[PDB]
């Protein structure tokens, strides 16, 4: 973001963001195991605060 | 001596059934609320 040309930019990437993926597992954006919500509470008591 | 004899026993019946039903429910409800304290866990974490 700023005074830059998408082009020049997109090129610099091509140049330094090298290395190509061979297998399919490399270009697979892994899905994350869902996180379960739990109605509950945690109470850290310190009357000295 | 006790003309009511009959109705009084028919009542005693309805009383037990309801009583049974209600005591059960209320026990659950009591347990359900206290569950928060019953399960509850605590640790002492001094700043050692
Ligand atoms: C007195 O009669 C009573 O009347 C009641 C109804 O009010 C019935 O339920 C009782 O069985 C009956 O004995």
UniProtKB/TrEMBL annotation, chain A:
Compartment(s) of residence: Mitochondrion inner membrane
Self-association state and partner proteins as the record states: Component of the ubiquinol-cytochrome c oxidoreductase (cytochrome b-c1 complex, complex III, CIII), a multisubunit enzyme composed of 11 subunits. The complex is composed of 3 respiratory subunits cytochrome b, cytochrome c1 and Rieske protein UQCRFS1, 2 core protein subunits UQCRC1/QCR1 and UQCRC2/QCR2, and 6 low-molecular weight protein subunits UQCRH/QCR6, UQCRB/QCR7, UQCRQ/QCR8, UQCR10/QCR9, UQCR11/QCR10 and subunit 9, the cleavage product of Rieske protein UQCRFS1.
Family: Belongs to the peptidase M16 family. UQCRC1/QCR1 subfamily.
Protein name: Cytochrome b-c1 complex subunit 1, mitochondrial
Organism superkingdom: Eukaryota
Span covered, complete protein: 200 to 248 of 446
UniProtKB/TrEMBL annotation, chain B:
Family: Belongs to the cytochrome c family.
Cellular localization per UniProt: Mitochondrion inner membrane
Protein name per UniProt: Cytochrome c
Subunit annotation: Component of the ubiquinol-cytochrome c oxidoreductase (cytochrome b-c1 complex, complex III, CIII), a multisubunit enzyme composed of 11 subunits. The complex is composed of 3 respiratory subunits cytochrome b, cytochrome c1 and Rieske protein UQCRFS1, 2 core protein subunits UQCRC1/QCR1 and UQCRC2/QCR2, and 6 low-molecular weight protein subunits UQCRH/QCR6, UQCRB/QCR7, UQCRQ/QCR8, UQCR10/QCR9, UQCR11/QCR10 and subunit 9, the cleavage product of Rieske protein UQCRFS1.
Taxonomic lineage from the root: Eukaryota, Metazoa, Chordata, Craniata, Vertebrata
Residue span relative to the full protein: 194 to 241 of 241
């Amino acid at each position: 973001a700023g005074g830059i040309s998408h082009k020049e930019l997109v090129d610099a990437a091509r140049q330094h963001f090298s290395g190509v993926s061979f297998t399919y597992k490399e270009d697979a954006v892994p899905i994350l195991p869902r996180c379960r919500f739990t109605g509950s509470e945690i109470r850290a008591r310190d009357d000295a605060l | 001596a006790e003309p009511e004899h009959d109705q009084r026993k028919r009542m005693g019946l309805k009383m037990l059934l309801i009583s049974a039903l209600l005591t059960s429910l209320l026990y659950y409800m009591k347990r359900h609320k206290w569950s928060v304290l019953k399960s509850r866990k605590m640790a002492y974490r001094p700043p050692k």
